[PDB]
RNA sequence: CGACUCUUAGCGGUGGAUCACUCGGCUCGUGCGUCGAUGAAGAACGCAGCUAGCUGCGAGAAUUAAUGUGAAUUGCAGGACACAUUGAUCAUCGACACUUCGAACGCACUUGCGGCCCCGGGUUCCUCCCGGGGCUACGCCUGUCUGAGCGUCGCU
RNA sequence: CACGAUCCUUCUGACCUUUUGGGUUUUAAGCAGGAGGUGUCAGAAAAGUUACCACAGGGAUAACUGGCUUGUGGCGGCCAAGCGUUCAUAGCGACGUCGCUUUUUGAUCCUUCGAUGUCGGCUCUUCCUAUCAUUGUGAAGCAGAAUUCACCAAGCGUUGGAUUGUUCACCCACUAAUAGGGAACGUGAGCUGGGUUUAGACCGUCGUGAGACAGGUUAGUUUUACCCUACUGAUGAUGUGUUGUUGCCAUGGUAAUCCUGCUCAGUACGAGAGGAACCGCAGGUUCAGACAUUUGGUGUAUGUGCUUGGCUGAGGAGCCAAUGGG
RNA sequence: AAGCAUCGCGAAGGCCCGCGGCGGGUGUUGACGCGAUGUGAUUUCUGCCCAGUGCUCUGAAUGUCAAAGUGAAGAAAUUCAAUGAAGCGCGGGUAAACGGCGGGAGUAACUAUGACUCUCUUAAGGUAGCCAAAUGCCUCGUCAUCUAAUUAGUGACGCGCAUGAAUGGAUGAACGAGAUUCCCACUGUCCCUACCUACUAUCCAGCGAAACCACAGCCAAGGGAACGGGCUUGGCGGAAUCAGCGGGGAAAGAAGACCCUGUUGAGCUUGACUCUAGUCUGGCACGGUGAAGAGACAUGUUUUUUCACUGACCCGGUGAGGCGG
RNA sequence: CCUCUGGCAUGUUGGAACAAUGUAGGUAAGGGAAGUCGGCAAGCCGGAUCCGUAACUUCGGGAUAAGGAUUGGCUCUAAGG
RNA sequence: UGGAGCCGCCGCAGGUGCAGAUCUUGGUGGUAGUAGCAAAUAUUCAAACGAGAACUUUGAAGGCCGAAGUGGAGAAGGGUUCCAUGUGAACAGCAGUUGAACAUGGGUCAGUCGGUCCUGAGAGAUGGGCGAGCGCCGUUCCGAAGGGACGGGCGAUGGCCUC
RNA sequence: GGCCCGUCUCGCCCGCCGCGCCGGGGAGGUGGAGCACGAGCGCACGUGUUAGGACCCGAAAGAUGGUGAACUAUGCCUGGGCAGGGCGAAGCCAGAGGAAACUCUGGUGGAGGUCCGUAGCGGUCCUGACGUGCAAAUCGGUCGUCCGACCUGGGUAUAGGGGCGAAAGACUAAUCGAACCAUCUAGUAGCUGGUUCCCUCCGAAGUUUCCCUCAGGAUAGCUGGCGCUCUCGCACACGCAGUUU
RNA sequence: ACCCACCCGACCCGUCUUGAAACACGGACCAAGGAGUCUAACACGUGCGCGAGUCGGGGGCUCGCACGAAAGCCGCCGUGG
RNA sequence: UAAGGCUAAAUACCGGCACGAGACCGAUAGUCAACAAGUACCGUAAGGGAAAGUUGAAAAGAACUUUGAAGAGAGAGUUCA
RNA sequence: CGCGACCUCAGAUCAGACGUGGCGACCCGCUGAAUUUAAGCAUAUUAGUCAGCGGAGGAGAAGAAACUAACCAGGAUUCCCUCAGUAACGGCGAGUGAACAGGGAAGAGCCCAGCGCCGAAUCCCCGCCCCGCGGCGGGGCGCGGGACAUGUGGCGUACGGAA
């Protein structure tokens, strides 16, 4: 399927 | 975790010695009636370079005393050997340089190299580059001789076992600085895969016992037992004293 | 009314559900219970008048012989045969045959190099050269021949 | 209230039972009662770390928003002992007291863990007023000038920089003034990514160590709009019989701003020092709406010179070099 | 990385492999070498601490310490005894081994600091150096300088939250797609935007996907699982579309990396618990010959000690070529 | 960068327009980093010959340091075998 | 409509009733005639064939690659892609009279060019050892590891038994 | 009330082939899943509870045996490749000075993990392009390096708790803090999700105690189903209650 | 029961949840498939047979089994449970 | 009566050859496989592994006419259709 | 320094035989987990189970008591029913777990070494004849080879055996 994001991007980041 | 570099050198594979261009082993002549009782004469046909070795060698050719046949050897060159020289060897050999004779014959204070550790072994002690042994003292009964090795140790030896008079050629090699990493690279390439060496402190803690940490430190004492399983025996092995 | 949109129905598309079939499976049972250096299984490459695949066979290659059967085979051709004759076509299968790899065997895996005996051309055993044929794995047993040993003796 | 199951051990107890084909003896095994302990006390035998991390799930549970609350912060009354030379209240206001506010921080955990992109700045619009300035006014401990206090009031404004990732802060400068906030602490398919907050590394402190640190440092991928709406503009739509005309106007929107100089005038006022204002007149700020006569900018009219390297044999005439260059 | 510095090993050895082998790698090697660690060119230095944890050296003088072996009593299973290996303890060394390196009071004819003194304390109590550093909490430290203005930069200062000497300290020319700060130049970075070119986007012919999709798609307020497209009450609502746009669909993407729970895990660590290859020691076996002597018990037995011997076993040499008489 | 030999048909299409946004190029008056976390981006500089070259230094470097001047076309001269 | 089997009652039996499982397999929409068919400067005129030409071919012009080539030959890899004739369904993201598509046939000739031989790093039998074992180790190491040759002698046959 | 077995306490007698450390009884308590004129066995259906793949789907992991070094990591063998400039190290020549030591000046010479810079190898910044791409990592400019620890073909070696690592837990065929393939395997799941026709009747709980228990069990409670035993509106009722007296 | 109109009523289902129209997840649409099974053991309830008994296995005797791998019978009828 | 040995039978049988049957499945089922299936296809390799049945009783499978370059049609015909 | 016995060992493309791989449902010998259960886990369990290696047959293995028992005694092995979820094992937890008897299916028992006796009375291979020859056998005849006294054959093996 469609790529979307990189492995280390992990979109909605909230640490 | 991992098998550490060090444990891996035992399996050979990549860490075996490089030996294509090596010119041969650097033995002594094998014993026989002539060596044992008189002295066989040979001539130094050439002096040679042997990759991965600081000592130069000497093609020395004799005559086989049984078949019409010119046998040849590779002596490690005693310093001051040259071509078109004769190289006598045996019991009744004359005590001059580049002349292999039993330690029992030669007097005290006599400097030798390529010295047989056990009679008939063909030349095992003191064969490095600037190195030699000195014949200390003889015990006529017991047929034994005391010899001072380059390490300092004063080993006991059979008076029968032979040595070439004089020191090894190419001495003082290690006085020259290397300077270039390149110059190091080129040294060990004609030997074996042992060069650019990575400090266990650098490594992650799976590949070395000093590894890991937020600071490149050892964390444990760097001295260690020698009743130590291979994988820990790292740093200073059985270190009697450790400092300066 | 106009176009467009929504709804229903008719007919047509798309799609292949349903139903109905079944030379396939799944399960249970019965009898027998058989591979191979006399070259297995497996693989390879071949072989049809037109044939690619599946099958069937091995340079005698969709098969030969034999026996049983008794007019076909058939996509088209062509043919045969006298189907009052060992005789088409199937079936069986006891005779014959069975390319190359493979335990795989002269040694190698290039399909490369050989040795040794015999035969035909080649010679006129002149060895060559070419072609054909038969041998040339390892292990082991029973014997056979040749041997080895300051192994144990005997006679000289 | 002051204490402890099974299993195991240990001690005590009977002329006790069994110890297996029978008998004797040691041994062991039973039966019955105490003791040896499980405090996570109805009773596993048990150290860390992970920022290299994983999986099952959880809004039963944190880290935002938003709710409730308002202690805390912010703002505002009431009372009136005082201050204010004198005089509670021009301006203030103790000891007490009553409130509002959600631009502070806490409580809390209702929503979201099959993810609502986590700070700041930029950019843009709109609202609020708890009004810094500007208009109109009441007050003074308002002579003038400067002023603080209050009212109507949010129309129009509220800037340029140095340091800092900053919010915040501070400083310089100008100004009429450099008021304060809100919009998911407005705004990442708007950017940016400096900072927080993966992985690489350094330092300090801590840790035996792996590693830790609202301790410092440096390096580190910022995806998608063609759907629907909203907004912007663009064709059209139903009606009027068709068509064209010139028109009206329901409803929406809406805009102007503040300053200087001159004059009044060294005048009023004032002991003086200082020092206004209304009407005029001349201009400027910010904003808005246009426009190109002029100045400037662009310029591939590829217009016209000039020039490099090359190429049509040369001249002349040209071309090529992603717009050859000027 | 060169350079420096430690450490192990003379080969029946160091280090290491391997399931096993008279196996293998280093090694066609022998300390100017092989192997194991640190530090990191040069210059200049490299202080003190062996208490702790390591490592190591010695060893009948000796606490404990297993199996076998020896004695003991017992009818025997047995029990008890003496004996006693490494290892622990006991005693030396070692910091270019891991590492570590203080705190009170008083004191100088203005004050202030404190050279000086006094204690209490450790294994020493941080030496040379260096500094608000890539290391300083307070912190935007203080002074100076750099600017009109500097939470920045530089230079100084040093009870330094929590600097510091091969866990290397201080330095330093050359070098660096390394981290800062300023100046000159240069510029549309900006004041402040503008015009031009090409390819797009646009319209057309031909061709023609995808994600996403409960239904859908105008607002205000209300209540509501405490931020509604749908509900209530209001405002309101007019076909079909085009180019744009990023406010909203808490848009899409991926069963949250954070956090917490699970009696789910994995990577790594060690003073976790339970084991284990390896290694070190002791016993029995292959394991023999002779000499001598020496104790212990007994009035022969056992323990054997040392010194030889060679025939097992091992190692080395060689085309097993001259060995012993 | 332009050319001959040889090779191609502009890289899976064409046509018409020349809007906004872009992607890739350029240019800008006056100022010159006031922008921004930060001169990011772009701009300056650039070849050669002739001068001239600092601190510091491991004496080797630094060094194209910095900072200057010249450069075309044409017609001659002199010097090198 | 369809064209060959099927039902009621009494009992027995079960792989017995779907809207959901980010369910499985297949199909179909809206999105949409939308995004899109924009890297590397470039095309134009005439003719031929042809049902039909923006794209084929020929000619003419204008352009590019610019000998570190968009030129001329190999290695590996492909495996008939090569050449010719024909087709215009499908495929070559427009078209095609074209193609590496499809269908018919053709097509690779060696003493000397290479494989072939050698040894390299290495691989690997035997002997030997290990091994529960398929086997492994080992490659000169615990091997009686040479089958060859010359000259002489003696025998045997095959040949003008001469040589 | 009684009887049987275990057990205790107290007691007094009987028996005989073997008189005994023999055997038998009595009274009174008390433990027993006992007896006290039997109810089981077999077959069938239903519900519940378990063990099994056990309602269906779902891990991260664990184990055994095999396949890969065509990418990449490192070693080894054999081949190939690297414009044009700058700086100008040793050595050498001449000239000048120097009494000597030797020193200056001009040349020549061409050193170097030397500088610029092409091919090559790389991959800094634009946090540019692209981001349902040309591309599952590409493009453009800008950059680093370019005689050496240089680049590179083929051959060859090392294999999974293993390799290889100038060390980033890097790389090991788009996969690495433990590769891939098949099996053990339908691994386990106190946790998500789903769980298929109608009517009818009854109809809860979130509280108990225990639990390495707190997102789960156990046990009480609350529910349903099956009943039974009786009662009397069949002029002829006892008992019971979320009351009150 | 097809379409249309009008008045009133009327948020989208599934699900976990104290609470869902939710700004909680799953769901574009349709077809087919798709989840409490079987074995064993226990317990209680119910139905049947026999009853101080009951029992059937296992084995055997009767058939080539068409229906049968059934059905029947057994001093085994009870070794045994 | 151990430290030596041989031995049919009742017993086992998801592989093979050859048969028989079924309260089974009926093409998303039943074996992966009703068909040119361990096929195509993928993967360096170990290994992975599909989809896919049905004209009609008979091919009687549409002669011929016509439009079109053709695919496609329009009539005609075959068939109970 | 010979020749000859034997012993222990080699080499033959010596004569003639055999073994090698496959299949693997069942069978024999080794080897041997971990998911899993215990609501955690380490013993236990999963399990002598999967994977691994070896070797077979139509079946294999087992088998003619160094057995059971404790009786008034049974009498090889295998199989079924039962014993029995019992005795026992077990963090005596989870869980695991046989045997004899009894009834059936079937039913079958034997041979060496030794100890002894018997002229090795025995065996293999050659070669000639007659039959028989697609599972190489019978009979005869050979001063034809060899094995064998370091022991072949007949009698005989515990139920006794020999003379
Ligand atoms: Mg690291
Ligand atoms: Mg470790
Ligand atoms: Mg319709
Ligand atoms: Mg289908
Ligand atoms: Mg007894
Ligand atoms: Mg970390
Ligand atoms: Mg952390
Ligand atoms: Mg790390
Ligand atoms: Mg909550
Ligand atoms: Mg007063
Ligand atoms: Mg809050
Ligand atoms: Mg959002
Ligand atoms: Mg107000
Ligand atoms: Mg916000
Ligand atoms: Mg937004
Ligand atoms: Mg974004
Ligand atoms: Mg950052
Ligand atoms: Mg980091
Ligand atoms: Mg568009
Ligand atoms: Mg001209
Ligand atoms: Mg160009
Ligand atoms: Mg060190
Ligand atoms: Mg110490
Ligand atoms: Mg420390
Ligand atoms: Mg100090
Ligand atoms: Mg600044
Ligand atoms: Mg400073
Ligand atoms: Mg320190
Ligand atoms: Mg020190
Ligand atoms: Mg430190
Ligand atoms: Mg909504
Ligand atoms: Mg939006
Ligand atoms: Mg989202
Ligand atoms: Mg989740
Ligand atoms: Mg997850
Ligand atoms: Mg719990
Ligand atoms: Mg774990
Ligand atoms: Mg421990
Ligand atoms: Mg173009
Ligand atoms: Mg084109
Ligand atoms: Mg192309
Ligand atoms: Mg400008
Ligand atoms: Mg600014
Ligand atoms: Mg600035
Ligand atoms: Mg720049
Ligand atoms: Mg400089
Ligand atoms: Mg029909
Ligand atoms: Mg069924
Ligand atoms: Mg459905
Ligand atoms: Mg378009
Ligand atoms: Mg060509
Ligand atoms: Mg062609
Ligand atoms: Mg096309
Ligand atoms: Mg129950
Ligand atoms: Mg179940
Ligand atoms: Mg699973
Ligand atoms: Mg585990
Ligand atoms: Mg980018
Ligand atoms: Mg895009
Ligand atoms: Mg393209
Ligand atoms: Mg793992
Ligand atoms: Mg399941
Ligand atoms: Mg739970
Ligand atoms: Mg009820
Ligand atoms: Mg829940
Ligand atoms: Mg909740
Ligand atoms: Mg709901
Ligand atoms: Mg809501
Ligand atoms: Mg959920
Ligand atoms: Mg959804
Ligand atoms: Mg269905
Ligand atoms: Mg019952
Ligand atoms: Mg047997
Ligand atoms: Mg089908
Ligand atoms: Mg089908
Ligand atoms: Mg099927
Ligand atoms: Mg069907
Ligand atoms: Mg059909
Ligand atoms: Mg059908
Ligand atoms: Mg019909
Ligand atoms: Mg076999
Ligand atoms: Mg468990
Ligand atoms: Mg569990
Ligand atoms: Mg666990
Ligand atoms: Mg077991
Ligand atoms: Mg198995
Ligand atoms: Mg048998
Ligand atoms: Mg027996
Ligand atoms: Mg028995
Ligand atoms: Mg029972
Ligand atoms: Mg068991
Ligand atoms: Mg006998």
Curated annotation (Swiss-Prot), chain B:
Write down the InterPro entries for this protein, in alphabetical order: NA-bd_OB-fold (IPR012340), Rib_uL2_dom2 (IPR014722), Ribosomal_uL2 (IPR002171), Ribosomal_uL2_arc_euk (IPR023672), Ribosomal_uL2_C (IPR022669), Ribosomal_uL2_CS (IPR022671), Ribosomal_uL2_dom3 (IPR014726), Ribosomal_uL2_RNA-bd_dom (IPR022666)
Covalent cross-link site, Glycyl lysine isopeptide (Lys-Gly) (interchain with G-Cter in SUMO2): 41, 148, 233
Q: From what superkingdom does this record's organism come?
A: Eukaryota
- Biological process, per Gene Ontology: cytoplasmic translation
Region described as Disordered = 206-231
Q: Name one Pfam family in it.
A: Ribosomal_L2
What is the recorded post-translational modification?
Answer: Hydroxylated on His-215 by RIOX1. The modification is impaired by hypoxia.
Q: Cellular component GO terms, alphabetically?
A: cytosolic large ribosomal subunit
Q: What are the entry keywords?
A: Cytoplasm, Hydroxylation, Isopeptide bond, Ribonucleoprotein, Ribosomal protein, RNA-binding, rRNA-binding, Ubl conjugation
- Example GO molecular function: rRNA binding
Q: Which residues carry this modification: (3S)-3-hydroxyhistidine?
A: 215
Q: Where is the protein situated, by its record's location annotation?
A: Cytoplasm
What is known about its subunit structure?
Component of the large ribosomal subunit. Interacts with CRY1.
The protein's role, per its UniProt record: Component of the large ribosomal subunit. The ribosome is a large ribonucleoprotein complex responsible for the synthesis of proteins in the cell.
The family line of this record is:
Belongs to the universal ribosomal protein uL2 family.
Q: What is this protein called?
A: Large ribosomal subunit protein uL2
């Amino acid at each position: 399927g469609m790529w979307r994001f990189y492995t280390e991007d992990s979109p909605g980041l909230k640490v | 975790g991992r098998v550490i570099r060090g444990q891996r050198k035992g399996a050979g594979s990549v860490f075996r010695a490089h030996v294509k261009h090596r010119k041969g082993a650097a033995r002594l002549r094998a014993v026989d009636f002539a060596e044992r009782h008189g002295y066989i004469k040979g001539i130094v046909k050439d002096i040679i370079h042997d990759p991965g070795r600081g000592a130069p060698l000497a093609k020395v050719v004799f005559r086989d005393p049984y078949r019409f046949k010119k046998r040849t050897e590779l002596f490690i060159a005693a310093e001051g050997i040259h071509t078109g020289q004769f190289v006598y060897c045996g019991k009744k050999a004359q005590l001059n340089i580049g002349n292999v004779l039993p330690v029992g014959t030669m007097p005290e204070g006599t400097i030798v190299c390529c010295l047989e550790e056990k009679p008939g072994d063909r030349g095992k002690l003191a064969r490095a580059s600037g190195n030699y042994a000195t014949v200390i003292s003889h015990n006529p009964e017991t047929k034994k001789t005391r010899v001072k090795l380059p390490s300092g140790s004063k080993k006991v030896i059979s008076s029968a076992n032979r040595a070439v008079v004089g020191v090894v050629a190419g001495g003082g090699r290690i006085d020259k600085p290397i300077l270039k990493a390149g110059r190091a690279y080129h040294k060990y390439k004609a030997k074996r895969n042992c060069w650019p060496r990575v400090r266990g402190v650098a490594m992650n803690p799976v590949e070395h016992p000093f590894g890991g940490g937020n600071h490149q430190h050892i964390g444990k004492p760097s001295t260690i037992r020698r009743d130590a399983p291979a994988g820990r025996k790292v740093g200073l092995i059985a270190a009697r004293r450790t400092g300066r």
